[PDB]
A paper describes a structure:
Trypanothione reductase (TR) is a key factor in the redox homeostasis of trypanosomatid parasites, critical for survival in the hostile oxidative environment generated by the host to fight infection. In the case of the Trypanosomatidae, redox homeostasis relies on the dithiol trypanothione (TSH), a peculiar variant of glutathione (GSH) in which two GSH molecules are joined by the polyamine spermidine. TSH is kept in the reduced state by the action of the NADPH/FAD-dependent protein trypanothione reductase, homolog to the human glutathione reductase (GR). TR is considered an attractive target for the development of new trypanocidal agents as it is essential for parasite survival but has no close homolog in humans.
Crystallographic fragment screening performed at the XChem facility allowed us to test 352 small compounds from the DSiP library, a collection specifically designed to ensure rapid and cheap follow-up synthesis. Data analysis, performed by the PanDDA algorithm, reported 480 interesting “events” clustered in 33 sites possibly associated to fragment binding. Visual inspection of these putative events led to the identification of 21 true binding events in eight sites, corresponding to 12 fragment hits distributed in 5 independent binding sites, described later in detail. All datasets have a resolution higher than 2 Å and the modeled fragments show a good correlation with the electron density maps, as proven by the real-space correlation coefficient (RSCC). Indeed, the RSCC is around 0.9 for most hits and always in the range of 0.77–0.93.
Numbering used by the authors:
A (entry chain B): 3 to 485
B (entry chain A): 3 to 488
Write the structure that this text describes.
């Protein structure tokens, strides 16, 4: 069958591109994915990674995890109940999450049913030729042909996949994919990785762990969450520790064996050992290009295995494009979506547009959470002669009463001190992901620190800290910190 | 007894002006207030209304009230506990609020002592003359002089005070001032009025009420929260109703009598009756001008009662200025603070600056809460030929799992459709007050709807809805509402 566009991967970027090309530009569109609903064996499905085994289910589970703090914190505000009656029922959480994800799967199914000129094909997409996508029964390229799709234009949108280190006993470890389907909450769990997925899952497991349970997070480097603001990295480490999570930095698994009861015996490179019920590898995500048989058309990959693209998401092969995680740049749903829309506008609208990968607001649903947009100070300090840091850090009042005195809210604004242009805003504490969104709009408008401090506060809020900072806390001048 | 600046009222506006003048411009400042710490008899104290009987304690108590919803909502996420064991200990909440407020009172005392040329004077400020403030022992102008203060510049920052309607039995009623100190949570309470204070307290009382408890809010007109977005006014009404609060609109107390058991018998203008344990009046606040003896220097008041000011906070009398609620405009702490910082940056900094009273971000800590900035559409529609309204309204997914299906999140952007300039942003739902702050910055920068929709979303948030709206839901054209443009 013949299409203006064939999209391989019915994910965040793929669905934006396919729906826009079909509905805004009246193109005949095919979209391919390996599953119509969430979970084993392929985990991602119609809707993509974010819907099925990412942002959507993890956010619901972090919300679930937050109640452990709310229940404890309620006492300071005079709430009384039988503490010994408190149980975290993980089965209910997983069932609630499964229903939520399945409902989305179903609506996307209804979307393809009800959208003329937008067709879904179940199976494994690969490139036969530069204008033919083959859909097969399995990821094995010798598996049965279900469809052959003639395509003026081909979009690769297959996303990414957990990285598993080749160590002895890797087979006894899981990724985030399996973590979403654990039938019982682990009593002891090691999250391996200092990234958002490890930190977010440490918080989820810490809340739902059965009595006498323990969550350990391990990371090779000295400080979790590289890429984030350093003050926030130190504070979130402290605040995770304060809520009972063991942060093992400068530590990495060397091998895993099974103890006689089926629990996992972890040997760290340092020789240290840990007995846990689950080992969750969250050490990285790699672009999913193996299964695409890109050798058939000579699309240029990087040694990492990402599809190389120009700013307009164009591969080295005309009429073949790549968006989203497969391009190994910013692995965010809204970036994927933005690239998909920009690509379709460019190619089918002749409305040339490229995604801006700078000043993207993002979040970490840690407990407590992070919101951030733009440059951290160390980065700004290499690119600008004079950099100012405006910093407010303090346990908010509600958390003196709550008993969570460790919950320091951090707000930091990084500026080009030569003109006061805001380069970065970095938040830690309840609300941070919600606060940072409109900050993304501020940085698009080249907001200066004067634009923040001349804006009238909403009081009382954590956000008003951003509009209450008149004076630098310190500077970088030619890369040197000057207190 | 000689100062560059004398400030009457150690509140939100008064202390910002005082501290700035002293620390930024090495000026000599006197600040007068009636009380050094919170509560009876004068309620407001060092730190002002907001710190003592306003934003700060109210926010702590709304946070306390939110745990009723979190404890119920936790069950959808798998939290299990003995629901019959749950009790709301009001006395604990009030004791914790009292300690939090006292620490702020003490924090301000430290500020005055640890700051050269910044001195606190206890007692009642009034104007003797153009350049002299008298501190007396009481509000009676006949009481003893404690001090006579020489002032190169006088700042009036005495704030506002609850209005109590002059109805038979008003003496059985409380204001917000007494609400903060109730020894026991009322079983039945009538919050009177449709403004933020009535709404916030109806939420607080609703969460802490003992078993068989009932919170009634009455409002004299048809729809609470006049001046807020109409969609949000209707929605908050529904969501308060859904959480057990009874909303009596077009109803107003004509009198209150004590029943023999100490409870209050409310007779409405309509003839309806209601027995409650507390009647909290929250029908308005009025500027505190009486006690300053303004007649003594001829400071002009408004047809309403507020000190008349120009854009630089100047009265008709030179060297005499007025900021905050005494001006009877926007009664918000950060507005008072902004006016104070501008007055001082003007007069002592030689850097004239005027508070912008448009595009002010503000909140209602209703459950769930409002965050708003700029014009509601009815107001935009009279000022602008073509107004677009962008609206998103849905129960977020977590609240389909929580079981609070009624918690619809509302996001509205109001624009000038001729250039896309955002004129206002109106939010109802968890985190709205936190979301709206950086929207205030966007409005200062003349953000267009395209600046929002071209900004990449943070996912998943409620906030990202603001970056997801490309197509108007409807328009006003020369005041007329319509789905489509001609
Ligand atoms: C645990 C986790 C949490 C995350 N949390 C967030 C968050 O909170 N916010 C955020 O913005 N981002 C988050 N992300 C990142 C976000 O999920 C991704 O950036 C986004 O899904 C990438 O979208 P995409 O279009 O590149 O691909 P995806 O949405 O992953 O879609 C790719 C699709 O292609 C399919 N597929 C793969 N190979 C083939 C093939 N050969 N043939 C057919 N179909 C194929 C897959 O089944 C999948 O559905 C998270 C990721 C994970 C793993
Ligand atoms: C229940 C309630 C909730 C509120 N919630 C919020 C909120 O969430 N957000 C917000 O922004 N605003 C809120 N406000 C409003 C806010 O409190 C005021 O806008 C703000 O306090 C006004 O500041 P001001 O500087 O005008 O005066 P105030 O802060 O009221 O300070 C006035 C001071 O003057 C003193 N005083 C009065 N007369 C004399 C005299 N003759 N001599 C000496 N001292 C005198 C008083 O003791 C008082 O301390 C709330 C108000 C109340 C009542
Ligand atoms: C979860 C959430 C809310 C409830 C209702 N109870 C709240 C507290 C009341 N209470 C006050 C003082 C003594 C009891 C009674 C109603 C139950 C379970
Ligand atoms: Br490091
Ligand atoms: Mg179709
Ligand atoms: Mg002093």
């Amino acid at each position: 069958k013949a299409f203006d566009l064939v999209v391989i991967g019915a994910g965040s970027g793929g669905l934006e591109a396919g729906w826009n090309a079909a509905t805004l530009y009246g193109k005949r569109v095919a979209v391919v994915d390996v599953q119509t609903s969430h979970g084993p064996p392929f985990y991602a499905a119609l809707g993509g990674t974010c819907v099925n085994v990412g942002c959507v289910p993890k956010k619901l589970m972090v919300t679930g995890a937050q109640y452990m703090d709310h229940l404890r914190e309620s006492a300071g505000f005079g709430w009384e109940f039988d503490g010994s009656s408190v149980k975290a029922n993980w089965k209910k959480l997983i069932a609630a999450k499964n229903e939520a994800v399945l409902d989305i799967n179903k609506s996307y199914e209804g979307m393809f049913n009800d959208t003329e000129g937008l067709d879904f094909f179940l199976g494994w997409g690969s490139l036969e030729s530069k204008n033919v996508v083959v859909v097969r029964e399995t990821a094995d390229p010798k598996s049965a042909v279900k469809e052959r799709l003639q395509a003026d234009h081909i979009l690769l949108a297959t996303g990414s996949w957990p990285q598993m280190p080749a160590i002895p006993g890797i087979e006894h470890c899981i990724s985030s994919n399996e973590a979403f389907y654990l039938p019982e909450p682990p009593r002891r769990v090691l999250t391996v990785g200092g990234g958002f997925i490890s930190v977010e899952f440490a918080g989820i497991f810490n809340a739902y762990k059965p009595p006498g349970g323990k969550v350990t997070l391990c990371y090779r480097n000295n400080l979790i969450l590289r890429g984030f603001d350093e003050t926030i990295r130190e504070e979130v480490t402290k605040q995770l520790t304060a809520n009972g999570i063991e942060i093992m930095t400068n530590e990495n698994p060397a091998k895993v064996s099974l103890n006689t009861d089926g629990s996992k015996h972890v040997t760290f490179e340092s020789g240290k050992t840990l007995d846990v019920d689950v080992v969750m590898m969250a050490i990285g995500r790699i672009p999913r290009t193996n299964d695409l048989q890109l050798g058939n058309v000579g699309v240029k990959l990087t040694p990492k295995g990402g599809v190389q693209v120009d700013e307009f998401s164009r591969t080295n092969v005309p009429n073949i494009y790549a968006i989203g995680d497969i391009t190994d740049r910013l692995m965010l749903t809204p970036v994927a979506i933005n690239e998909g829309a920009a690509l379709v506008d460019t190619v089918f609208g002749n409305k040339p547009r490229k995604t801006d990968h700078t000043r993207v607001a993002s979040a970490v649903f840690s407990i407590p959470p992070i919101g951030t947009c733009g440059l951290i100070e160390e980065v700004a300090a290499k690119e600008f002669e004079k950099v100012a840091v405006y910093m407010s850090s303090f346990t908010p009042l509600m958390h003196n009463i709550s008993g969570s005195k460790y919950k320091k809210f951090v707000a930091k604004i990084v500026t080009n001190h030569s003109d006061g242009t805001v380069l970065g805003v970095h938040l830690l504490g309840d609300g941070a992901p919600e606060i940072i969104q409109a900050v993304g709009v501020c940085l698009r408008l080249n907001a200066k620190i004067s634009d923040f401090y001349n804006t009238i506060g909403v009081h009382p809020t954590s956000a008003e800290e951003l509009c209450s900072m008149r004076t630098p806390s310190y500077y970088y001048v030619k890369g040197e910190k000057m207190e």
